Design a protein. Structure first.
Lengths: 121, 121, 215, 113, 50
RNA sequence: UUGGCACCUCGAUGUCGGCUCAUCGCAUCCUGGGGCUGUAGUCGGUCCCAAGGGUUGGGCUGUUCGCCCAUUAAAGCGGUACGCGAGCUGGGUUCAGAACGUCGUGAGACAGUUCGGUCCCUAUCCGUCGUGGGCGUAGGAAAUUUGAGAGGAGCUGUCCUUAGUACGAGAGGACCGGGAUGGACAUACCUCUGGUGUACCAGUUGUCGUGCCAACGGCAUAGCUGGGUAGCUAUGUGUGGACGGGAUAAGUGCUGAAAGCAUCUAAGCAUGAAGCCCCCCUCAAGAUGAGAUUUCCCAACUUCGGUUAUAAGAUCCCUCAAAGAUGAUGAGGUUAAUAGGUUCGAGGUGGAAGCAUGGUGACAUGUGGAGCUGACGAAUACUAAUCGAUCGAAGACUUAAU
């Protein structure tokens, strides 16, 4: 691996799946410096599967994404697998990498760690 | 064969069937022997009817090892068994027959009678 | 008598005259230029300064070592050349056979020369006494509470101190080591690569000095 | 895949041997200089593994001589193999057939394709 | 291993020579007008320009 | 060593053997050099100089000690709280239980024996091993270096030739020379042989879930099993203790007198050891005695008899690993390949999903060496190293020469 983030092997990969899913549902989250440095690889590799749009690519993405429901506006409820292959994948058909960005904020109270903003470009 | 307690079986025509290594010759502090090295051993198992009897201390030479040896061409040869031949004072077999394959590295040494009787060298 | 500077690429193997296997390492020595000459009258000893890898030009907004600075440009302009990032002196060579600004080709050596190689070993960090000094462990069972610690460090109130040179945990690696009596297997032209029989200290992309054996 | 390494080890590569996979019967013709006369010795068996590489790629062949297992390993491009035959091609489910070291008799046979 | 002797206040002040903190390393933000951390956003308006 | 005395310690200096780590002496076990011999040769005995290096694994016994087995060039003797328990153990001895022999009227004791029986401590100072800041080195910086000193290494066997020669009735059998190859030890490295490889590939068991069939996901040591990239490794792969100078020790001499002879010595000149100093490897100018070489920058305001910032150069901050506890070191910061992403490869695994075909069925075949792939090699500014800030010199006095 790259870095362990003070977690066991089984529970580290479960946290990365939750972080990747949340960055698709809301497209903008705030978290720790170290965690966001490695969510880039997970999220950006997942959009690559979405652009291909194959059945083998869709089943290879269903083993990383969680099961949630999208409901923000008045339209029909949608999943997270459907959103990635239907909305995100159509905004990067002409882009080669660099689907995410990181912006630093500063140290937070009570912990001393710095928070950052990661979002889809 | 390697250590001071390894159990070696024999492939010659003598009363001995299994021997236990006692000393590796060829220097002070030497703790490992290979194919073509003389050792001091004792006869732990013997067959009814033969020249060598149980409990006798005899000399022997190593003809097969599981670890194997490396040649100058970069090739290796390994065996599935560890074997030895009881020799006489003038580097000659005490028995009259040799069983199984024998390593080719005895040919370059002075053990020529062992190679001659060996079914395959 | 003769020597060059180069980088370490990696290890490989080639077959010999009678089919034997020879493990060799690949060393790339290119862009070597004589930069200065030292004499007894001026300095007190005879040697030559040799640069290995050239840098870029001077920059007003430079912030890293990729671009040579102002004092490093004037040293490489005394003789027509480019500013280099490695400079070493060779003291075993003859001054009368070299000129200032002269190229040092890879063809100085031939297949069959006996050479020695010096470099900086790989660093291992802060290590214990077992790895750093090759000491023996204590029992791992039988009620033992002594596995990897160092043993006694002194004797008693007679000598109420520790002698200098005691083996203690510390940082290991990163030392300058010379390997003597190595064999040149093949010198390759149009690619500037020397094949050295054996191995050299240091990791990949390191700097190695090659010289003729003094013994 | 360093370009400098791939160049100095280009003339050492030889293209005369056929393609084979572990599990097939193979014949090796090895020259030996024992004594004073050079002759050819033939080695049969089954290719138990093929560890990959470039100039440093090797393969291992195992055979039973007189009830004792013997394994020989050679470099693929060594200048001591005159030619290589392939008698039959077997059907295996993996690459390293290390399980055959402990199986003897009818349990150590590989079905022909 | 208890201390053998009482530590004087001369040794204590010498030991704390390097026990200190420094300024964060702030720079002026040419949108807000007040200082901000380098490579970070302006807390008053959230402008990480450039 | 066993003793004699009772000078320090009873408001505490903790024993015997074993493990780990050593260090010192020479009254020398091996190796190097000599004299004598009742030294023919290969072997021996005794004495002299010499401390550089080396000096084994097991069986019995808590044992030191001793005997025995198998090797080796050799299996040396002593000091250091009979070295070392704030470095380890606790087999014996000095606790509380129980038994035997023996003594005692008895409670109980050994000139003895047997079974079992809590080993605490977060390092303040000196010492030792690594690694950073401040100041000095008469202007401020970047590289390359000399070596006053210090540390490291120092061992040795067996075969071939000389030569079956010298010697010897025969048995037997060489000095002085020339080669090959090992044992132990030290160092470097991962091409080969293996080990590990918890974000790689594959198979399989029970149970819950994605509504269901297929395809998958969580849990059960990483559920278990078979392989395995990079890094880190030995048992793996290379190298080393070489050839030589100067002065010596015990010895051996030349010439020569005191003493008309003889005599190595009083003057003079030689030769002579693994031992001393060089030679080989590493650190080293805080070496305050602070060294040398090659480049880089040189003014406005003053009368201040001095400041001032700026230049050369180095940092704050950010992207990293060949480096690393931190720090430091090294690769970069848009005029940019430093890291991530993307597209190609190396290596690893072993034939993906879907569909068609054969079979009632579990399953087998092609499409196709397919699909997937962490650390390894290239190309590519799509993302993030934005914008700025801080430190940083104008060269003191005396004498001599041009």
């Amino acid at each position: 691996g790259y870095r362990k983030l003070g977690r066991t092997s089984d529970q580290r990969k479960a946290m990365l799946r939750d972080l990747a899913t949340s960055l698709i549902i809301s497209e903008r989250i705030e978290t720790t410096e170290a965690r966001a440095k490695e969510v880039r690889s997970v999220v950006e590799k997942l959009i690559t599967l979405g652009k291909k749009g194959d059945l083998a690519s869709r089943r290879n993405a269903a083993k990383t994404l969680r099961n949630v429901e999208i409901l923000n506006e008045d339209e029909t409820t949608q999943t997270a697998l459907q959103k990635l292959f239907g909305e995100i994948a159509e905004r990067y058909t002409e882009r080669q990498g660099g689907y995410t960005r990181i912006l630093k904020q500063g140290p937070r109270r009570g912990d001393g760690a710095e928070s950052v903003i990661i979002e889809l470009v | 064969m390697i250590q001071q307690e390894t159990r070696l079986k024999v492939a010659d025509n003598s009363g001995a069937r299994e021997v236990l290594t006692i000393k590796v010759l060829g220097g002070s502090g030497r703790k490992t022997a290979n194919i073509g090295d003389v050792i001091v051993c004792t006869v732990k198992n013997a067959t009814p009817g033969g020249v060598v009897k149980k409990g006798d201390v005899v000399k022997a030479v190593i003809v097969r090892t599981k670890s194997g040896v490396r040649r100058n061409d970069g090739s290796y040869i390994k065996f599935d068994e560890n074997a030895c031949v009881i020799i006489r004072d003038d580097k000659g077999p005490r028995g009259t027959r040799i069983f199984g394959p024998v390593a080719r590295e005895l040919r370059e040494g002075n053990f020529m009678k062992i190679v001659s009787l060996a079914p395959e060298v | 008598t003769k020597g060059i500077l180069g980088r370490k690429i990696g290890m490989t193997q080639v077959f010999g005259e009678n089919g034997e296997l020879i493990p060799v390492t690949v060393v790339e020595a290119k862009e070597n230029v004589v930069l200065q000459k030292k004499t007894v009258e001026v300095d007190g000893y005879n040697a030559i300064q040799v640069g290995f890898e050239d840098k870029k030009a001077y920059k007003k907004d430079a912030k890293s070592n990729k671009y040579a600075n102002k004092p490093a440009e004037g040293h490489a302009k005394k003789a027509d050349a480019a500013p280099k990032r490695f400079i070493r002196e060779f003291r075993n060579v003859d001054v009368d056979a070299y000129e200032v600004g002269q190229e040092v080709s890879v063809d100085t050596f031939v297949a069959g020369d006996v050479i020695d190689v010096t470099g900086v070993s790989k660093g291992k960090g802060f290590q214990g006494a077992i790895k750093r000094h090759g000491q023996s462990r204590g029992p791992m069972s039988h009620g033992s509470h002594f596995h990897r610690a160092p043993g006694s460090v002194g004797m008693a109130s007679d000598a109420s101190r520790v002698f200098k040179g005691q083996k203690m945990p510390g940082r290991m690696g990163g030392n300058t080591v010379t390997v003597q009596n190595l064999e040149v297997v093949q010198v390759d032209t149009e690619n500037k690569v020397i094949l050295v029989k054996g191995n050299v200290p240091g990791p990949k992309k390191g700097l190695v000095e090659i010289r003729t054996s003094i013994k | 895949n360093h370009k400098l390494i791939e160049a100095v080890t280009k003339s050492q590569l030889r293209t005369d041997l056929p393609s084979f996979r572990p599990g097939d019967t193979l014949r090796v013709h090895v020259r030996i200089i024992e004594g004073t006369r050079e002759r050819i010795q033939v080695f049969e068996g089954v290719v138990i593994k093929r560890r990959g590489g470039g100039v440093s790629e090797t393969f291992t062949v195992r055979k039973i001589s007189s009830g004792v297992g013997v394994e020989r390993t050679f470099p693929l491009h060594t200048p001591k193999i005159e030619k290589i035959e392939v008698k039959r091609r077997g059907k295996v489910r993996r690459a390293k057939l290390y399980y055959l070291r402990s199986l003897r008799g009818k349990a150590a046979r590989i079905q022909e394709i | 291993a208890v201390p053998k002797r009482r530590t004087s206040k001369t040794r204590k002040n010498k030991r704390r020579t390097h026990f200190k903190i420094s300024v964060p390393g702030m720079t002026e933000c040419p949108n807000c007008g007040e200082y901000k951390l380098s490579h970070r956003v302006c807390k008053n308006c959230g402008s990480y320009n450039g």
